[PDB]
Subunit: 270 residues, 4 copies
């Protein structure tokens, strides 16, 4: 057994998938399970809380009340919630895995700054699959990227409010960059009516919105006579939960530093 973890947001959609990824994953022990103050607990965290019962781990509201039973903090909640946890941790030297998105800048500066006293793994997408794909797209842009036509199709469930996906964009920059360009100089997002021919040097984006699709990203580099395509399909949010949980175990032994998934996946040596 090992590394104890505290899963904040235990009853939230992400927090559940985390309890499971933790119980059924070796080298990591479920130390605590938090929650908002003024919400129905359910003691046995992962017990009732996450499908499969048991776990004498009880979903508290404290923190100081748990300081000694978790080595690492996994946070997929809210920027307001996160900043607070970030402050207790940084005081008592607990490392954190941060999957809360949506911080204002002043927000990220906290994290950056806190990362000098404690070890933080903070990332926009915690799916290993998406993280590799991003490195591949790079190598690839470096050969065919140039002289090939480059389009990015992403599909999402019917409740995503913003188009294109933040991953599709992330995919776009990975590529714009590698060819040494700027995504904003060469991106095209809409195609309506008489468009005229496809401007060379541009990166187009198509976005599908339907049913419950969790998340699909495709990149193609099309030439005359051939097409390369790299697709990552997400069938479940558990995909992100294994990534976060694998990162905790990774931060094991670490102190000070801000890392991300490339750090954890060693993708810079790739």
């Amino acid at each position: 057994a090992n590394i104890r973890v505290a899963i904040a947001g235990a009853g939230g959609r992400m927090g559940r998938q985390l309890i499971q990824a933790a119980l059924a994953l070796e080298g990591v022990q479920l130390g605590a399970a938090l929650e908002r103050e003024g919400s129905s607990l359910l003691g046995s965290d992962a017990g009732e809380l996450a499908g499969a019962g048991k776990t004498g781990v009880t979903v508290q509201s404290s923190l100081d009340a748990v300081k000694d039973d978790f080595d690492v903090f996994i946070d997929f909640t809210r920027p307001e919630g996160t900043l607070n946890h970030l402050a207790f941790c940084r005081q008592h030297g607990k490392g954190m895995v941060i999957g809360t998105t949506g911080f204002d800048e002043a927000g990220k500066q906290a994290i950056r700054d806190a990362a000098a006293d404690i070890a933080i793994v903070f990332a926009a997408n915690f799916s290993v699959g998406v993280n590799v794909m991003l490195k591949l797209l790079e190598k690839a842009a470096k050969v065919m990227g140039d002289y090939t036509d480059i389009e990015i199709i992403e599909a999402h469930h019917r409740h995503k409010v913003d188009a294109p996906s933040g991953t599709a964009l992330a995919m776009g920059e990975a590529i714009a960059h590698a060819l040494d360009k700027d995504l904003k100089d060469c991106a095209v997002y809409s195609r309506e009516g008489h468009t005229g021919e496809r401007v060379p040097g541009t990166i187009g984006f198509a976005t599908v919105r339907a049913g419950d699709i969790v998340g699909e990203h495709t990149a193609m580099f099309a030439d005359i006579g051939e097409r390369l395509e790299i697709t990552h399909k997400a069938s479940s949010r558990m995909t992100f939960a294994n990534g976060a949980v694998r990162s905790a175990l990774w931060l094991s032994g670490k102190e000070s530093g801000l890392f991300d998934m490339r750090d954890v996946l060693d993708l810079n040596n790739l």
Copy 2:
């Protein structure tokens, strides 16, 4: 052997694929091969003209000079060219297969009107594959169409000037209709920035533009837990050439009438 055909536009991209589809297709004989006046002929039509030599069929400029050696006229040229052929044919009772697009209304009225003296097969897309797919989409809209999320993705080579494809639209109406709605009341073509959730009852469209893709059309009806998808992929323009050539042989025996591919494919009995 049978039915003699005259392939106008013999040296144009479509006209070539027609000579091949004709020579290598049973029940049809290559009677003539036309062309514009003031263009390099090449006698043996399909001979040099279409990859595989031979054919003592010679690419003339006339029409009256060929009246007696072709039963049917296949035209994939220009509206201006077409109207002329339409006039000789309608006089001397030659049936026609018309794949020229882009007629102004006054244009289509000609065709409509001419179709009372001769038998015409005139259609927007001559691919059998696309024509069936359209009937399927209908049956399908009639069950899941309703309560499912309906998106249409189409991809085309880098030189298509207008987005969405005229087939994608055609796909959209097939569906809007079947559910008894109007495509213009419920179509969404662009998705940029903060979109908000996907409005129910709408039909979205995504359009990819890359390399040399000849033509790809996909329709999905997405629910919670499942997705149906119907895709037609075109790998070569020959796809349209077999459709047109199969239609000539179909118009065999016919006189007066305006038909299309459903007529020919018997899709209304489907």
Copy 3:
């Protein structure tokens, strides 16, 4: 509110998805929730049992003890379990929706026979999506089926023991039949080493086995120059649960008869 249903197998993988499909589906009320004798109940059926708490419906072991609070019986358990339920129902005139597979013949004859006293909806695949797709494949085989190359690819999670899928087969017969042939005369299942060219008139099958894929079925009819493809993707077992639950509400008003999904979906009028 309406039609009361009894969900047998409440704590089994299917039985859960049923409680949800029932609570959140209009015209149907959760009357009972059964289970094996000598298993941990949990009263509030769909409550704890199916993710979302509440439901003063309690998971009993009886049947006579519930006779008066359910109009229809939904069974996704075991042939041995099913035959028993089938016997109580047929006595007290409760209609049934049967999703238990694996009956020996003597088994199906029971069902057939029982269907004269009560109304039964019994089917191999309860996904609407798969059921439509099957009707489409038919219409389609009837046009291009002939002269086109027909292949069927299916993918499943890593724990499916038998290859090809029983749906892929079901897809194969739908097609073999429509062209008036027999699947066993023209099916090819393996392709290894020097195969020789693809025999015309045959239907090939390719089967992928990986990760947690719930279920993917694709049918293509390939010619020279074009391909039609019809794919059904299942993202969750809920897909079958809505189908079964929609069928109960369908059996509302019915007495005697054996039906299936075409019955329910009106696909024979399609």
Copy 4:
């Protein structure tokens, strides 16, 4: 203008696509166009021979008769033909791009040996797209390869005689290797009847055979919750012709050495 090339096999399916790739590609000039002795020439090589007329390049039968008008030899013919060209070249120091497959070992030893006097680029698949994809698969196996389920689907036209594709195999080894295993210890090629669960550690292969598909290769690494997929689609044989022609220009300046596409594409620095 530059580098002169001699395209042997000018009237063969590959030889044509080469004349085009050469004329319409900068830095390369069409020096000669060969052919078998006792076959209808057609002078203007790429002229009639390859769709677009002209080229005062005439399709000879010699070699010594062309020695001084081509710097590089591109051969996509027959092992028997190739060995002969290999012998003239190696004498008179002409570099070669070799796309003829099917040599017996004694055959490859020739090439290997000849490569000490002249510069040879010899490769199994000359598509840039396939060559990159292969490097990507490697990086990728190195992260997710392990603990993920790995399947390879390939589709080909209806006249491929051997299954799985030689690229699919090549894909399999790229991966088996990277994880440091041997493809022959862990490959599964057929899946029929009661298979039992998917053995971990194995690489499965599914093979589709239909219509005129030129060549499709997909690799997926499937986990619980996510799938990565890398696909290369070939729409035309021109895909290989640009690869070969890009290699000639690459061999410009070179003397002695045996290289392949990684050499040319610099993929070992990738």
